[PDB]
Amino acid sequence: GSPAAAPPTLPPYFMKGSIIQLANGELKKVEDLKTEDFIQSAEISNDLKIDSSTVERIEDSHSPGVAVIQFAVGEHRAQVSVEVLVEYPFFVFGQGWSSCCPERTSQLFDLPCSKLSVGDVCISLTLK
Amino acid sequence: GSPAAAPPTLPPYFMKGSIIQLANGELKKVEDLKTEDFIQSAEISNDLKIDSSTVERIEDSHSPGVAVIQFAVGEHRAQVSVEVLVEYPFFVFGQGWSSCCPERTSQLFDLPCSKLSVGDVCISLTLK
Numbered sequence: 184g185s186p187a188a189a190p191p192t193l194p195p196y197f198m199k200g201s202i203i204q205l206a207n208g209e210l211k212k213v214e215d216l217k218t219e220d221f222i223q224s225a226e227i228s229n230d231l232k233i234d235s236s237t238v239e240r241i242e243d244s245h246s247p248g249v250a251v252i253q254f255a256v257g258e259h260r261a262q263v264s265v266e267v268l269v270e271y272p273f274f275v276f277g278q279g280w281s282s283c284c285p286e287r288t289s290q291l292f293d294l295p296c297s298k299l300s301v302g303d304v305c306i307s308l309t310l311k
Numbered sequence: 312g313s314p315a316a317a318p319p320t321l322p323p324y325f326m327k328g329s330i331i332q333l334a335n336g337e338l339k340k341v342e343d344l345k346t347e348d349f350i351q352s353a354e355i356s357n358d359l360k361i362d363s364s365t366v367e368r369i370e371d372s373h374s375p376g377v378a379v380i381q382f383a384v385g386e387h388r389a390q391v392s393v394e395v396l397v398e399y400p401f402f403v404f405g406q407g408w409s410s411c412c413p414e415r416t417s418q419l420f421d422l423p424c425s426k427l428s429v430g431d432v433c434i435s436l437t438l439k
């Protein structure tokens with residue numbers, strides 16, 4: 184079948200040394216974020232909730248530098264296949280920042296990443 | 312409420328109130344970013360390689376609150392159709408933060424936001 188395409192640009196906070204303001208008034212550098220920062224920040228926020236998507240499959244795209252990743256999204260495991268840039272950092276539950284290509288994420292952002300793998304649970308924040 | 316969305320498709324809400332570390336070591340509040348903060352070169356030449364994507368078309372989606380955006384991506388203009396929640400913030404060359412629904416982006420990200428338009432050239436802040 185035909186995957187959905189992800190946004191073709193990356194947001195700026197992935198740049199190492201950027202500082203996030205969490206819904207606990209706390210400030211952390213992006214490279215220092217932990218899983219509990221998201222969970223606690225979501226818990227406190229009246230607007231945001233935590234959700235998650237599990238990596239089911241990673242395949243090469245026909246475009247070089249792009250992966251096709253199959254996700255199982257949220258508690259009913261809705262199946263979504265998306266084209267994503269290999270440098271895109273996902274935040275993996277109990278791991279931290281992870282990408283299809285850590286070396287490229289290092290080149291672009293200086294953000295240390297683990298290699299994204301099948302079974303990884305990626306954290307997201309969505310509106311209520 | 313809207314269709315299943317992979318992690319990189321979601322607006323990055325938690326970048327609200329972030330401080331971005333620019334390639335040169337400067338710091339900028341995310342709402343204060345300018346096009347020049349994206350450009351390394353202190354004097355743009357026709358040398359200047361930018362990675363960008365240009366908006367070609369914007370349509371309503373069957374799903375409410377979601378827009379479908381066609382992009383021409385990169386130097387070779389790959390055609391990519393991207394479905395996103397309308398508040399998704401793009402940084403536009405010569406314009407700044409823009410979206411398919413400025414009002415909602417401003418309230419959710421606490422920044423000034425323009426309407427995304429056909430012709431808008433969308434960029435990412437990176438080292439590159």
Ligand code: NA
Pocket residue numbers: 225226227228229230231232
């Ligand atoms: Na919450």
